[PDB]
Structures are given as C-alpha cells and as structure tokens.
Amino acid sequence: FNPLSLEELGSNTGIQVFNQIVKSRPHDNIVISPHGIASVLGMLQLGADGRTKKQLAMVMRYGVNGVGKILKKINKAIVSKKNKDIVTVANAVFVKNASEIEVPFVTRNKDVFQCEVRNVNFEDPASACDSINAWVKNETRDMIDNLLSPDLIDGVLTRLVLVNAVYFKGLWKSRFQPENTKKRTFVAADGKSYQVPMLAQLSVFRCGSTSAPNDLWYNFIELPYHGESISMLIALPTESSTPLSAIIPHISTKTIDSWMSIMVPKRVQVILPKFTAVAQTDLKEPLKVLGITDMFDSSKANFAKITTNLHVSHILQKAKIEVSEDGTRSSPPWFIVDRPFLFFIRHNPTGAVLFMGQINKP
C-alpha cells in the first residue's frame, strides 16, 4: 500500500538472501543488490501460476498485479537522472524462443521492471553465453561482462535464465584528495596484512555505534553522494578480536533505521580502501531456503503466463561498485576501514537498498 513499506518488504527479502550467502561464505567478497533481488522476483511473478506463483507471493508478501504502478515508480526513481549519481541496472529474461512468449508478460516486464525478455540459442551454450555477455556489457556502459560460461548451460535442458546486473560509482558530496591516498595495511580474515590504497579525508560525517544482538559492538558511518539522494553506509566491529561474521547476523532494514536514529554528524578522520567491489552469484539456492522451490524444478515449475515444460535454470546477479576519490579543537575520532567490513548503498527517498556487500579483501 505505502511506497516506503513496499520497498521495505523487497529490500528485506533481498537482505535475507545476502545473510544466507554470507553465512555460507564467511570469508569471501559478497556483493548483492537486495532491491535487484526484489525486482527479479517480481519479474518472475509476472509469469508464474499455481503453486509457483503462490510460493513467490508468500515470500515477497505481495502480488505484482495491483502494486505494479508503485513498483514502477520506485524503480524509475532509483535510476532517474534526477539523482545526479547514476545507478545502472540491466534486467533480462533470456528465453529460448522469444516469439512464443505471451505479450502481457513481455509488456509488463518492460513497463514495471525495465526488464527485457530476449531470446537466445541455448542449444549452443558457448554462443548463448556470448550473446548474454554482449548484452550485459552493452547494457551496463561496458562496465560489466562475463556473467555466464558454457558449463552453466545445458544445451538440451536449459530454457530460462534470469539476469540482474547493477553498476554504480557516483560522486562524493565531499571528495577525497589524491595526495591523501596512501597504501596502508588492511588485515583480512586470514589475519594476514595486505597493502591497500586508501582514501583519507578529515571532514564532517554522520556516524555512530551500537551493539549487535550478541552484545558485540561495532561502528558505522554515512558517506553521502553529491546528488544527496544516495549514500554509502559502512559498518565494521569496534574490536579487532570481533569477526565481521559476529555483527552481521539479523541485519535488516530495521537495523538501518536504527542507525539513522543513532548517527549524528561529527568531525572525523575517514580512511577507506580505494577499490572496486564486484561479485556474481546464482540466487537459486538461497531462494529455495526462503521457500521458492517449484520454479527451479523441471516438473513442478508453472510459468503458464509466459508460454502456452518451462522452468528457471539460474538467476544470475552481478553487482559492481567502484570506490574512488572523485566528488565535489580536541582530537577528532577516527573511522579507519582496515579490517573486513559491511557496506550498503541506499537510495534514501525510497529506502531502497541498492547494494549490500561484505568485503573481506579489497
């Protein structure tokens, strides 16, 4: 009903997926787009029927029909040039014969999710991956490539593959200066030291601390982008003897809301790895854990609203963010990101969580 609430449901679904992956891969770099996950489920809901649709609706806690206009408004508002800081999103449903597809499914997807339903020759795995990769690269300002390999495709079997790709860089409201960018020690999960280029600036930023449910403390900071609609949030443990895995469980939009009412602006020396965060993942397994099983099963899958047989083989998401310099008394506290950390990219007007990442090694 309410735009902010609707986005909250979607972002939390996306975050729950992140929480799964991160629990299974505690020491890897994981970069997900929680909102992209929400969109990808909406895309599929447009074509589902019977139990397949029922599982999706139950997990998402809403139906696309009758909320589409709201979903659409949110989606266009995230990618809008009005943001000044530009988020690039590429959504596609790759299908073996795109001509046979029902029009509403194609139409609704383009309208609501800026999703293209495109055909591909799965009978030729390699060429198939070529086309998909060529499309992602072309659709992401050439910032993202290499999503699929032939090995992920079954030439006879594969009939449907979803793709969600998100890229972002933007410009800081308060720039970092290159003269201040120095190589510094980052202590990764293995406990080894790494030499990393790090941005540094002394400036006013909203920041805080709070404890996880288990009483382990951590610090967080907000770094706004110049358009003032998007901001990065960063959290890492207060004590070096606290692993990132001890503070990230049970994180949800509520946690982010909690930070909002704790953060106050203050003068801080910020020290942050200059790096590019990028990860790809197949959403299939985590989605099953949430209770969405049919769409992945050869027999039980029911996408009668796509074609008048059909199941989802993979749902691939690739997220890529660059963190760089570019932008517009008593001793100050420091915020030094020198150990594994968590970060969000948030679209504040809608509350959409565009990025969520765990960085174990920049």
Side-chain angles (χ1 to χ4, degrees), residues 2-53 55-60 62-68 70-72 74-75 77-80 83 85-95 98 100-109 111-122 124-126 128-136 138-140 143-145 147-155 157-158 160-181 184-253 255-297 299-304 306-307 310-328 330 332-362:
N2 174 346
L4 303 177
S5 271
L6 192 55
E7 181 50 31
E8 221 156 62
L9 289 169
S11 268
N12 272 312
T13 290
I15 293 175
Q16 282 175 225
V17 170
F18 174 87
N19 291 338
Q20 280 196 233
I21 301 165
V22 129
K23 247 154 280 195
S24 80
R25 311 296 306 155
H27 296 147
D28 292 348
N29 291 341
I30 301 294
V31 188
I32 292 299
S33 175
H35 176 86
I37 291 187
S39 305
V40 156
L41 293 175
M43 286 154 46
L44 291 178
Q45 214 200 77
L46 257 19
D49 198 12
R51 253 251 299 247
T52 296
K53 180 186 168 68
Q55 295 178 339
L56 279 162
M58 185 231 81
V59 171
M60 295 163 63
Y62 63 82
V64 176
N65 284 11
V67 159
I70 307 185
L71 264 19
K72 185 190 173 193
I74 295 174
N75 283 330
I78 293 171
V79 176
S80 169
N83 286 292
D85 301 284
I86 309 302
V87 185
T88 306
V89 183
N91 288 326
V93 177
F94 291 96
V95 77
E100 224 179 322
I101 317 272
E102 295 167 51
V103 186
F105 176 83
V106 176
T107 303
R108 294 283 281 167
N109 262 310
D111 185 47
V112 174
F113 300 109
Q114 310 73 212
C115 178
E116 305 212 359
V117 27
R118 303 178 65 99
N119 103 110
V120 81
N121 190 23
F122 283 122
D124 177 10
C129 302
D130 276 4
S131 287
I132 300 176
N133 290 338
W135 174 86
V136 180
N138 181 39
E139 207 77 314
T140 59
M143 292 312 292
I144 295 170
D145 192 353
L147 262 74
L148 310 79
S149 277
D151 59 279
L152 279 167
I153 290 171
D154 171 0
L157 299 200
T158 303
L160 190 54
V161 168
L162 267 282
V163 173
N164 173 231
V166 189
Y167 171 86
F168 178 81
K169 184 190 179 174
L171 292 163
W172 297 119
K173 171 174 174 181
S174 182
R175 74 187 173 192
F176 292 84
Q177 287 182 310
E179 302 77 24
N180 297 313
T181 298
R184 303 183 184 266
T185 299
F186 183 95
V187 181
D190 55 20
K192 299 182 185 177
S193 293
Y194 296 80
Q195 256 226 0
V196 185
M198 294 195 189
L199 317 165
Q201 83 175 264
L202 206 194
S203 181
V204 183
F205 290 106
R206 282 157 54 85
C207 51
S209 7
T210 190
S211 63
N214 59 3
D215 279 359
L216 264 13
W217 285 82
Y218 66 94
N219 301 302
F220 47 92
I221 185 163
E222 185 185 43
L223 298 54
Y225 292 92
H226 81 292
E228 286 184 328
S229 54
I230 303 176
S231 56
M232 176 178 286
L233 279 41
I234 304 190
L236 84 166
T238 302
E239 300 188 14
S240 78
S241 54
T242 290
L244 185 58
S245 59
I247 69 168
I248 68 191
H250 314 302
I251 294 194
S252 72
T253 54
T255 314
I256 301 182
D257 294 348
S258 181
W259 297 349
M260 297 300 189
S261 53
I262 300 174
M263 296 187 306
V264 291
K266 72 185 62 175
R267 187 162 145 269
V268 201
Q269 258 286 175
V270 181
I271 294 198
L272 203 204
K274 150 155 174 131
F275 78 112
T276 304
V278 51
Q280 176 192 310
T281 205
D282 188 358
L283 269 21
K284 174 160 60 183
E285 294 301 308
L287 289 176
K288 293 186 185 185
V289 170
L290 290 186
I292 301 162
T293 51
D294 290 7
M295 74 185 193
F296 300 115
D297 184 284
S299 316
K300 303 180 183 170
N302 184 339
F303 289 100
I306 286 175
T307 203
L310 200 64
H311 74 99
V312 178
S313 292
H314 298 293
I315 300 172
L316 307 169
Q317 177 176 86
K318 191 154 179 169
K320 178 165 175 175
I321 180 185
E322 176 177 359
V323 178
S324 193
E325 287 93 345
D326 311 45
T328 284
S330 34
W334 289 61
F335 197 101
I336 307 163
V337 177
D338 58 2
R339 298 158 287 122
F341 64 100
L342 182 88
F343 79 84
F344 290 102
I345 295 292
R346 190 169 186 266
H347 186 256
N348 301 303
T350 61
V353 185
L354 314 178
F355 282 79
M356 185 171 189
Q358 111 168 329
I359 302 303
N360 275 112
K361 197 167 68 179

